[PDB]
Amino acid sequence: ACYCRIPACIAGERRYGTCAYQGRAWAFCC
Amino acid sequence: ACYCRIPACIAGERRYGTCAYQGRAWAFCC
Amino acid sequence: ACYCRIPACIAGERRYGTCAYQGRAWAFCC
Amino acid sequence: ACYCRIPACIAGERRYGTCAYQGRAWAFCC
Structure with missing residues (x-):
């Protein structure tokens, strides 16, 4: 899955x- | 976590x- | 992490x- | 897996x- 993460x-x-x-x-992270 | 969805x-x-x-x-939904 | 996959x-x-x-x-898959 | 890299x-x-x-x-690389 992916996430939006701060920072x-x-x-x-x-x-x-x-x-x-x-x-x-937010960082778009997977 | 985040997912692409329709509608x-x-x-x-x-x-x-x-x-x-x-x-x-697609809606990107978290 | 993400892969560009077929099919x-x-x-x-x-x-x-x-x-x-x-x-x-390709499908962007994560 | 794919990644974004400089240069x-x-x-x-x-x-x-x-x-x-x-x-x-960034170069999108897979």
């Missing part, structure tokens, strides 16, 4: 983009 | 954005 | 997009 | 596209 992805996940939601930029 | 996110989810694939726009 | 996502993976590589479409 | 893919991966996050562009 970065977590160990074992990779970043592929950015979620833009509630005035924050 | 809508499911009770309990938040629409964080939009996916695009197979000719369609 | 389908595998096992617990779900689709988030479409990879395109010189005319070939 | 290019690790030799052996194919460049399937471009990622954009954190204000930078």
Whole structure:
């Protein structure tokens, strides 16, 4: 699955983009 | 976790954005 | 993490997009 | 599995596209 994470992805996940939601930029991570 | 859905996110989810694939726009729901 | 798979996502993976590589479409699976 | 890397893919991966996050562009590699 994928996640929107603040402030970065977590160990074992990779970043592929950015979620833009509630005035924050979240890492798009899977 | 987040999922692409049509027509809508499911009770309990938040629409964080939009996916695009197979000719369609999808709710991206986390 | 994410794979660009043909023909389908595998096992617990779900689709988030479409990879395109010189005319070939792949499922973006994560 | 696919990843986003600067400045290019690790030799052996194919460049399937471009990622954009954190204000930078990355090779999308699988």
